[PDB]
Design a protein around this ligand. Structure first.
Ligand SMILES: Cc1ccc(OCCn2c(SCCOc3ccccc3)nc3ccccc32)cc1
Ligand SMILES: C[C@]12CC[C@H]3[C@@H](CCC4=CC(=O)CC[C@@]43C)[C@@H]1CC[C@@H]2O
Length: 250
């Protein structure tokens, strides 16, 4: 009996509703103000998920908040890619049961090319045959995939933590196979998939940052925590002070 997977599966967040009035015409301001609200709500869930992760309260308290606040985009995109694959066979974007994106909403949001990228990512889940155990490990692993170039308050704890999640992923892959190249292939595949979440998250950091700057001119609302994170933390990523941790060089 695997204690690590039990935990990952126990703490997985439920459904989060976007609060969207689907009875509105699909306007830009309204799709975007709703996505923002989805962001702010999902944040609360990510925090409590992250805090109930194995080894996590180990990290220094400020590092705990830092790594949540750099990594959120990556996490939410990956999950949403999954929700999309499990429900709507990847065909649309399952932001929340009350906020699914069709083509038309992908154009109206004005972030059409990002949505296409998110859709693709979503499809990889099918193409690779990602099991729910792989999904869960990879997603938790994503929490420790982006950090300040000049390290964290307790970087050693962090590096140990991350190493452990990597080895746990290797475990979920390997406790079921036989032939030799099989487990190499697969691990290569997942490290590549995990890597590819980063340029997408980066496109979306740019996007939302831009939006926030021009939100008064455009009637898009940003909730308190989303405002703050996007103006304090995202800029550290955009300017290159915080950076992802790739497995492979691009
Ligand atoms: C809530 C809780 C309880 C016990 C914990 O023990 C730490 C275990 N741990 C760790 S160790 C974190 C490294 O930092 C430390 C902290 C204290 C002493 C030595 C190293 N990495 C893990 C990866 C997967 C699963 C568990 C992992 C962590 C959180
Ligand atoms: C950041 C953002 C609001 C929050 C969105 C984000 C797109 C990706 C995303 C996926 C989710 O499943 C929840 C909300 C988030 C995190 C949106 C892109 C522009 C908008 O400002």
């Amino acid at each position: 009996q695997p204690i690590f997977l039990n935990v990952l599966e126990a703490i997985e967040p439920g459904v989060v509703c976007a609060g969207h009035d689907n009875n509105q015409p699909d306007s830009f301001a309204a799709l975007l103000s709703s996505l923002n609200e989805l962001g702010e709500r999902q944040l609360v869930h990510v925090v409590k998920w992250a805090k109930a992760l194995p080894g996590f309260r180990n990290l220094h308290v400020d590092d705990q908040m830092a790594v949540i606040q750099y990594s959120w985009m990556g996490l939410m995109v990956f999950a949403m890619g999954w929700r999309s694959f499990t429900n709507v066979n990847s065909r649309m974007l399952y932001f929340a049961p009350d906020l699914v994106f069709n083509e038309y909403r992908m154009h109206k949001s004005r972030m059409y090319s990002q949505c296409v990228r998110m859709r693709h990512l979503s499809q990889e889940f099918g193409w690779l045959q990602i099991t729910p155990q792989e999904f869960l490990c990879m997603k938790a692993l994503l929490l420790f995939s982006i950090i300040p170039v000049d390290g964290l308050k307790n970087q050693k704890f962090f590096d140990e933590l991350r190493m452990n999640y990597i080895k746990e992923l290797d475990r979920i892959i390997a406790c079921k196979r036989k032939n030799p190249t099989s487990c190499s292939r697969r691990f290569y595949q997942l490290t590549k998939l995990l890597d590819s979440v980063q340029p997408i998250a980066r496109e979306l950091h740019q996007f939302t940052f831009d939006l926030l700057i021009k939100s008064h001119m455009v009637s898009v609302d940003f909730p308190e925590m989303m405002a703050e994170i996007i103006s304090v933390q995202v800029p550290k990523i955009l300017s290159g002070k915080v950076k992802p941790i790739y497995f492979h060089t691009q």
